[PDB]
């Protein structure tokens, strides 16, 4: 491997997603869940038990057609009902790109708020998994970040996944929620059994620090947490570790406040460097924090290739790649 709310239970990240979906269908009689293979529980177990508990009209399989899954979900949402669509791997969200970018994101604007699909959420497994190669590993968030009118949210853990997914489901805008698949059955943590929300468009500073700011999302948050530890032990460097959580609209203020304090920024993500979301954060921080920058903002990202099978260990922006970049930046 490269990496206050009432009663809780240990849950891994697949279980936390089920818990959020269960809490949703319990409290919102309009809500339905659909997509390929969700009825028997899904290919990553995220919908286990829900059709037996809520009914076949509420948790059901569609034909194998992703542009149809999203257009159908938009249609449900136009009527005001909560529509929770699944796309089986984020790599297969592209057939639905026109329905997401040209239709869902623009629905409310283009109608003058006469119609909307705010009650749509699209959830999909995301990110590398050790051996997924080109079409089981992708992290498409930067493709969606350039589309005003959708929100894109990615959690780092089971507690975070359930509170951010419930926020997506209840938010009155169409949301894509990317579930890091390599964490589905990784370590459990305590997760409240009843519903709770974590705000969208809010980053989280998970460790305070004074020398450098590190920003990541998804599984890569754990990588940068470990880089922080390596930096403290080997270099005596204090790192502020931030999980961005929402890709758009993103929390510009929390990131800029951190960088005004530290004077340094390193952004990391599994997605390719060119056009990746680190470019937006970098260019923005450079505009707002220019006079504070002690060194150039560093992006440690996947290379600009498709995501390889046998070469995955050499492709990912692992802790050594991030640490080496950090070391050079500290020495700039």
């Amino acid at each position: 491997a490269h990496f206050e709310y009432g009663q809780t239970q240990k849950m891994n990240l697949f279980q936390s997603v089920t818990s959020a979906l269960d809490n949703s269908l319990a409290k919102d009689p309009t809500a339905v869940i659909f997509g390929e293979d969700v009825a028997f529980g899904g290919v990553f177990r995220c919908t286990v038990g829900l059709r037996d508990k809520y009914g076949k009209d509420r948790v059901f399989n569609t034909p194998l057609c992703e542009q149809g899954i999203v257009g159908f979900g938009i249609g449900i949402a136009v009527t005001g009902a909560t529509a929770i669509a699944e796309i089986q791997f984020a790599d297969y969200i592209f057939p639905a790109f026109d329905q997401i970018v040209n239709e869902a994101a623009k629905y409310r604007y283009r109608s003058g708020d006469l119609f909307n699909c705010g009650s749509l959420t699209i959830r999909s497994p995301w990110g590398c998994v050790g051996h997924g190669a080109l079409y089981h590993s992708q992290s498409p968030e930067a493709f969606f970040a350039h589309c005003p009118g959708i929100k894109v949210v990615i959690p780092r853990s089971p507690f975070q996944a359930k509170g951010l997914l419930l926020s997506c489901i209840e938010d009155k805008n169409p949301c894509i929620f990317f579930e890091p698949k390599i964490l589905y059955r990784a370590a459990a943590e305590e997760v409240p059994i009843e519903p709770y929300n974590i705000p969208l468009s809010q980053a989280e500073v998970i460790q305070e620090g004074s020398d450098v700011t590190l920003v990541a999302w998804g599984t890569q948050v754990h990588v940068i947490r470990e880089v922080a530890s390596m930096a403290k032990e080997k270099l005596g460097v204090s790192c502020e570790v931030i999980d961005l959580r929402t890709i758009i609209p993103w929390d510009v203020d929390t990131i800029c406040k951190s960088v005004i304090k530290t004077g340094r920024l390193l952004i990391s993500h599994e997605a390719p460097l060119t056009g990746g979301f680190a470019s937006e954060i970098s260019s923005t921080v450079q505009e707002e924090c220019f006079l504070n920058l002690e060194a150039p903002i560093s992006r440690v990202c996947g290379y600009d290739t498709p995501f390889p099978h046998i070469f995955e260990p050499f492709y990912i922006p692992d802790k050594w790649k991030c640490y080496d970049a950090l070391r050079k930046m500290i020495n700039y």
Binding site: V70, G71, I76, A77, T79, A81, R108, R110
Partner: protein, 371 residues
């Protein structure tokens, strides 16, 4: 004897390919001939006089509006326009068979549904001019109409996207109970899009109360149907998805009404989709054919025709003149409704435009924009 889950069929011991029947396709249902005469009395819907005069007046008012807005577009007074010529009967006839609250999705040939639903001429005009009265806030190209009150979902330019969406709205209607249909209109060119195959299959497997209404006029822009498909039009595709299907004469308002009435009745009772393909001409016209019917019954004459032609021109010209002299909406409206709530970074862009206009406003056409 075959035991395959994927299909129910017998064995056959001789190799025989199945040939499409395209020369003798699905026949075209017609109620009145070109002289406005009822062909088969058992099929006459016997609609009452006031309803049939409403069909005729909605079509002709739409036609009057098209003439004026098409000229307005030729002059650059509005930027774009799509007419309804040849499609007045498919739209008024089908709209008349719906309940007022049945939800409509469509594209660029559906303004007659709004006109039957008494959408004000002021609001058609407001959208085309993008003025302060437009509830779409001037954001879309002309003829991208929408009305929440009249259950007509806002038009978008990308073709066929509304097809799977209509199916989702019909699934949600089924769950809500309350006995509503969705109708979804599209042309034969749009039916070539992947989203039509998505909508058609989902409606059947998920058992949705939806009418798919395809208008086939033989052309999509410059493309004749010989380059669009090689089967027997669109109606012949319905049965392959398990969808009950029919083809109708789109120049016959009563054939369209009858097929839509019966499709609505069965879709809502049975929770199954229906496909109607109405054949039309790219422009023996729906208005002329209904006028001949009216005459037969003694329900119209040349004097009434003259007075209505005059009155309709007056009503459209009044709306036209008012629409041209309204201001456009406040430029601040380009930033709202992107999300339900304006994100702070989007508010910052709005503030940036406001500061910009304070300094450079002489260079912007500020004078016909509100506040």
């Amino acid at each position: 004897k075959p035991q395959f889950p994927g299909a129910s069929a017998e064995f056959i011991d001789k190799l025989e390919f199945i040939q499409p029947n395209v020369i003798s396709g699905i026949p075209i249902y017609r109620v009145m001939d070109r002289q406005g005469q009822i062909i088969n009395p058992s099929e006459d819907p016997h609609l009452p006089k006031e309803k049939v005069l409403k069909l005729y007046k909605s079509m002709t008012l739409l036609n009057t509006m098209d003439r004026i807005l098409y000229e307005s577009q030729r002059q650059g007074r509005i930027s774009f326009y799509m007419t309804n010529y040849g499609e007045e009967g498919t739209h008024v006839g089908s709209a008349a068979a719906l309940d007022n609250t049945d939800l409509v999705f469509g594209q660029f040939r559906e303004a007659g549904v709004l006109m039957y639903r008494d959408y004000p001429l002021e609001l058609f005009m407001a959208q085309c001019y993008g003025n302060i009265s437009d509830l779409g806030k001037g954001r879309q190209m002309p003829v991208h109409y929408g009305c929440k009150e009249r259950h007509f979902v806002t038009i978008s330019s990308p073709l066929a996207t509304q097809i799977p969406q209509a199916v989702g709205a019909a699934y949600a209607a089924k769950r809500a109970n309350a006995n509503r249909v969705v109708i979804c209109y599209f042309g034969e060119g749009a039916a070539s899009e992947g989203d039509a195959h998505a909508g058609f299959n989902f409606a059947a497997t998920l058992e949705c109360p939806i009418i798919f209404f395809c208008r086939n006029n033989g052309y999509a822009i410059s493309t004749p149907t010989s380059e669009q498909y090689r089967g027997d039009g669109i109606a012949a595709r319905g049965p392959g998805y398990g969808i009950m299907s029919i083809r109708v004469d789109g120049n016959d308002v009563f054939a369209v009404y009858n097929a839509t009435k019966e499709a609505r009745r069965r879709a809502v009772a049975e929770n199954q989709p229906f496909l109607i393909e109405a054949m039309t001409y790219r422009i023996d016209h729906p208005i002329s054919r209904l006028r001949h019917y009216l005459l037969s019954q003694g329900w119209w004459d040349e004097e009434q025709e003259k007075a209505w032609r005059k009155q309709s021109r007056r009503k459209v010209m009044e709306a036209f003149e008012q629409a041209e002299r309204k201001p456009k909406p406040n430029p601040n409206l380009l930033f709202s409704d992107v999300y339900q709530e304006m994100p702070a970074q989007l508010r910052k862009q709005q503030e940036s435009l406001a500061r910009h206009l304070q300094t450079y406003g002489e260079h912007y056409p500020l004078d016909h924009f509100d506040k």
